[PDB]
Design an enzyme around this catalytic site. Sequence first.
Site, PDB file in Angstrom:
ATOM      1  N   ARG A  92      -6.453 -41.691   7.389  1.00 59.78           N
ATOM      2  CA  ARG A  92      -6.447 -40.763   5.921  1.00 59.78           C
ATOM      3  C   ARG A  92      -6.774 -39.176   6.450  1.00 59.78           C
ATOM      4  NH1 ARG A  92     -10.716 -40.750   1.717  1.00 59.78           N
ATOM      5  NH2 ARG A  92      -9.694 -39.947  -0.170  1.00 59.78           N
ATOM      6  N   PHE A 149     -10.036 -30.746   3.212  1.00 59.77           N
ATOM      7  CA  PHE A 149     -11.075 -31.881   2.937  1.00 59.77           C
ATOM      8  C   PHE A 149     -11.561 -32.454   4.067  1.00 59.77           C
ATOM      9  CE2 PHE A 149     -11.858 -36.219   0.573  1.00 59.77           C
ATOM     10  CZ  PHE A 149     -13.134 -35.805   0.668  1.00 59.77           C
ATOM     11  N   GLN A 208     -10.464 -38.608   8.327  1.00 62.77           N
ATOM     12  CA  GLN A 208     -11.197 -40.002   8.492  1.00 62.77           C
ATOM     13  C   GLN A 208     -10.367 -40.785   9.535  1.00 62.77           C
ATOM     14  OE1 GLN A 208     -11.196 -41.605   4.688  1.00 62.77           O
ATOM     15  NE2 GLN A 208     -12.105 -43.514   5.124  1.00 62.77           N
ATOM     16  N   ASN A 220     -17.689 -44.405   3.641  1.00 63.53           N
ATOM     17  CA  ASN A 220     -18.304 -45.790   3.305  1.00 63.53           C
ATOM     18  C   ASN A 220     -17.685 -46.053   1.804  1.00 63.53           C
ATOM     19  OD1 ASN A 220     -19.754 -44.544   0.621  1.00 63.53           O
ATOM     20  ND2 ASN A 220     -21.176 -43.828   2.178  1.00 63.53           N
ATOM     21  N   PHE A 244     -15.695 -39.538   9.316  1.00 64.29           N
ATOM     22  CA  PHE A 244     -14.890 -38.111   8.944  1.00 64.29           C
ATOM     23  C   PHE A 244     -15.636 -37.107   9.742  1.00 64.29           C
ATOM     24  CE2 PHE A 244     -16.984 -36.523   5.197  1.00 64.29           C
ATOM     25  CZ  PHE A 244     -17.882 -37.553   4.811  1.00 64.29           C
ATOM     26  N   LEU A 286     -20.223 -34.713  -1.380  1.00 69.15           N
ATOM     27  CA  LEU A 286     -20.698 -35.790  -0.428  1.00 69.15           C
ATOM     28  C   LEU A 286     -22.104 -36.074  -0.258  1.00 69.15           C
ATOM     29  CD1 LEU A 286     -17.473 -36.152   1.451  1.00 69.15           C
ATOM     30  CD2 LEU A 286     -18.014 -37.129  -0.656  1.00 69.15           C
ATOM     31  N   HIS A 323     -22.956 -39.836   1.442  1.00 68.79           N
ATOM     32  CA  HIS A 323     -22.230 -39.920   2.824  1.00 68.79           C
ATOM     33  C   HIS A 323     -23.441 -39.583   3.970  1.00 68.79           C
ATOM     34  CE1 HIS A 323     -18.263 -41.187   1.693  1.00 68.79           C
ATOM     35  NE2 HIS A 323     -18.552 -40.542   0.685  1.00 68.79           N
TER      36      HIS A 323
HETATM   37  N1  LIG Z   1     -12.062 -28.772  -3.141  1.00 69.49           N
HETATM   38  C1  LIG Z   1     -11.909 -30.135  -3.320  1.00 69.49           C
HETATM   39  C2  LIG Z   1     -11.609 -31.018  -1.909  1.00 69.49           C
HETATM   40  O1  LIG Z   1     -11.668 -32.534  -2.681  1.00 69.49           O
HETATM   41  C3  LIG Z   1     -10.776 -33.640  -2.394  1.00 69.49           C
HETATM   42  C4  LIG Z   1     -11.857 -34.802  -3.083  1.00 69.49           C
HETATM   43  N2  LIG Z   1     -11.514 -36.170  -2.952  1.00 69.49           N
HETATM   44  C5  LIG Z   1     -12.796 -36.935  -3.131  1.00 69.49           C
HETATM   45  O2  LIG Z   1     -13.869 -36.656  -3.056  1.00 69.49           O
HETATM   46  C6  LIG Z   1     -12.524 -38.613  -2.997  1.00 69.49           C
HETATM   47  C7  LIG Z   1     -12.581 -39.006  -4.312  1.00 69.49           C
HETATM   48  C8  LIG Z   1     -12.789 -40.611  -4.270  1.00 69.49           C
HETATM   49  N3  LIG Z   1     -11.777 -41.231  -3.747  1.00 69.49           N
HETATM   50  C9  LIG Z   1     -12.116 -42.250  -2.537  1.00 69.49           C
HETATM   51  O3  LIG Z   1     -13.237 -42.991  -2.694  1.00 69.49           O
HETATM   52  C10 LIG Z   1     -10.800 -42.962  -1.949  1.00 69.49           C
HETATM   53  C11 LIG Z   1     -10.781 -44.007  -1.606  1.00 69.49           C
HETATM   54  C12 LIG Z   1      -9.564 -44.346  -0.782  1.00 69.49           C
HETATM   55  O4  LIG Z   1      -8.945 -43.680  -0.140  1.00 69.49           O
HETATM   56  N4  LIG Z   1      -9.671 -45.791  -0.339  1.00 69.49           N
HETATM   57  C13 LIG Z   1      -8.514 -46.232   0.584  1.00 69.49           C
HETATM   58  C14 LIG Z   1      -9.359 -47.540   1.405  1.00 69.49           C
HETATM   59  C15 LIG Z   1     -10.070 -48.438   0.755  1.00 69.49           C
HETATM   60  C16 LIG Z   1     -11.124 -47.916  -0.162  1.00 69.49           C
HETATM   61  C17 LIG Z   1     -11.344 -49.107  -1.316  1.00 69.49           C
HETATM   62  C18 LIG Z   1     -12.132 -50.142  -0.397  1.00 69.49           C
HETATM   63  C19 LIG Z   1     -11.386 -51.251  -0.179  1.00 69.49           C
HETATM   64  C20 LIG Z   1     -11.750 -52.401   0.694  1.00 69.49           C
HETATM   65  C21 LIG Z   1     -12.913 -52.448   0.996  1.00 69.49           C
HETATM   66  C22 LIG Z   1     -14.083 -51.088   0.682  1.00 69.49           C
HETATM   67  C23 LIG Z   1     -13.304 -50.283   0.054  1.00 69.49           C
HETATM   68  C24 LIG Z   1     -10.256 -46.988  -1.187  1.00 69.49           C
HETATM   69  C25 LIG Z   1     -12.231 -47.212   0.207  1.00 69.49           C
HETATM   70  O5  LIG Z   1     -12.788 -46.641  -0.624  1.00 69.49           O
HETATM   71  N5  LIG Z   1     -12.489 -46.991   1.678  1.00 69.49           N
HETATM   72  C26 LIG Z   1     -13.660 -45.986   1.955  1.00 69.49           C
HETATM   73  C27 LIG Z   1     -14.021 -46.347   3.263  1.00 69.49           C
HETATM   74  C28 LIG Z   1     -14.754 -47.663   4.085  1.00 69.49           C
HETATM   75  C29 LIG Z   1     -15.597 -47.236   4.746  1.00 69.49           C
HETATM   76  C30 LIG Z   1     -16.367 -48.517   5.319  1.00 69.49           C
HETATM   77  C31 LIG Z   1     -16.161 -49.702   5.006  1.00 69.49           C
HETATM   78  C32 LIG Z   1     -16.775 -50.750   5.762  1.00 69.49           C
HETATM   79  C33 LIG Z   1     -16.143 -51.862   5.949  1.00 69.49           C
HETATM   80  C34 LIG Z   1     -16.403 -53.012   6.775  1.00 69.49           C
HETATM   81  C35 LIG Z   1     -17.913 -52.990   7.396  1.00 69.49           C
HETATM   82  C36 LIG Z   1     -18.460 -51.795   7.246  1.00 69.49           C
HETATM   83  C37 LIG Z   1     -18.116 -50.761   6.261  1.00 69.49           C
HETATM   84  C38 LIG Z   1     -14.879 -50.082   4.139  1.00 69.49           C
HETATM   85  C39 LIG Z   1     -14.271 -48.709   3.526  1.00 69.49           C
HETATM   86  C40 LIG Z   1     -13.083 -44.910   1.829  1.00 69.49           C
HETATM   87  O6  LIG Z   1     -12.244 -44.338   1.977  1.00 69.49           O
HETATM   88  N6  LIG Z   1     -14.081 -43.992   1.123  1.00 69.49           N
HETATM   89  C41 LIG Z   1     -13.673 -42.574   0.631  1.00 69.49           C
HETATM   90  C42 LIG Z   1     -14.301 -41.429   1.350  1.00 69.49           C
HETATM   91  C43 LIG Z   1     -14.276 -41.686   2.767  1.00 69.49           C
HETATM   92  C44 LIG Z   1     -14.431 -40.681   3.823  1.00 69.49           C
HETATM   93  C45 LIG Z   1     -15.141 -39.393   3.193  1.00 69.49           C
HETATM   94  C46 LIG Z   1     -15.179 -39.369   1.791  1.00 69.49           C
HETATM   95  C47 LIG Z   1     -14.908 -40.204   1.093  1.00 69.49           C
HETATM   96  C48 LIG Z   1     -14.826 -40.137  -0.503  1.00 69.49           C
HETATM   97  C49 LIG Z   1     -13.658 -39.525  -0.969  1.00 69.49           C
HETATM   98  O7  LIG Z   1     -12.536 -39.771  -0.418  1.00 69.49           O
HETATM   99  N7  LIG Z   1     -13.723 -39.057  -2.075  1.00 69.49           N
END
Ligand SMILES: NCCOCCNC(=O)[C@@H]1CCNC(=O)/C=C/C(=O)N2CCC[C@](Cc3ccccc3)(C2)C(=O)N[C@@H](Cc2ccc(-c3ccccc3)cc2)C(=O)NCc2ccccc2CC(=O)N1
Length: 164
Positions: A54, A59, A62, A101, A112, A121, A125
């Site tokens: 991702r 941004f 990841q 997370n 990331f 964040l 995070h």
């Molecule tokens: N100037 C403006 C610029 O602005 C752009 C702004 N966009 C922003 O702020 C955005 C706005 C909010 N959208 C999001 O949360 C996007 C989510 C997204 O893609 N999913 C696709 C992948 C799956 C999902 C849902 C899911 C499904 C199954 C299990 C768990 C969750 C959703 C997920 O949630 N998986 C985690 C990652 C993770 C990490 C660890 C584990 C774990 C597993 C096993 C053992 C231990 C731990 C599981 C999943 C994810 O990806 N977390 C999102 C994230 C990751 C890294 C950094 C930050 C963010 C927040 C973000 O992305 N926030």
Amino acid sequence: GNPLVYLDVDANGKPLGRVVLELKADVVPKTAENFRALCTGEKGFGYKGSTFHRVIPSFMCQAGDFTNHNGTGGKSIYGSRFPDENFTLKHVGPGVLSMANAGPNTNGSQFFICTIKTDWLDGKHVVFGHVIEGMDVVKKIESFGSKSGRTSKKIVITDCGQLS
Ligand SMILES: NCCOCCNC(=O)[C@@H]1CCNC(=O)/C=C/C(=O)N2CCC[C@](Cc3ccccc3)(C2)C(=O)N[C@@H](Cc2ccc(-c3ccccc3)cc2)C(=O)NCc2ccccc2CC(=O)N1
């Protein structure tokens, strides 16, 4: 001495170069050690061969889901998951290394590297390191991203480890 680790990254098999990261074991020792060990592979699993799954320009990039390769998987060296150690370090700008997370206390292996300041964040995070060399390689990774996060080439951590 804070540990230094490296990620060698390729895009569709073409090397992009090396990212060197300083892990802030002086502030978040448990989180730093998880990432260190996942780079060396010493628990028998880790980042080698896995992808940046991702990547969102202006941004972050990841990676670290070495089980499902899609943002749903991975595991820590402490069992599946571990709690947020602290929120001391902030998402201050490009090069920040932080734990992905799915909500509170869901750290595994996914991580990331920020390409901007991501203050929304902070407190959500766990930041645990910084790029000290190879930010240009991070920008190359970023250039293969998209608004959806889908990548336009397969971005693989060809090799990784610790520098001692
Ligand atoms: N100037 C403006 C610029 O602005 C752009 C702004 N966009 C922003 O702020 C955005 C706005 C909010 N959208 C999001 O949360 C996007 C989510 C997204 O893609 N999913 C696709 C992948 C799956 C999902 C849902 C899911 C499904 C199954 C299990 C768990 C969750 C959703 C997920 O949630 N998986 C985690 C990652 C993770 C990490 C660890 C584990 C774990 C597993 C096993 C053992 C231990 C731990 C599981 C999943 C994810 O990806 N977390 C999102 C994230 C990751 C890294 C950094 C930050 C963010 C927040 C973000 O992305 N926030």
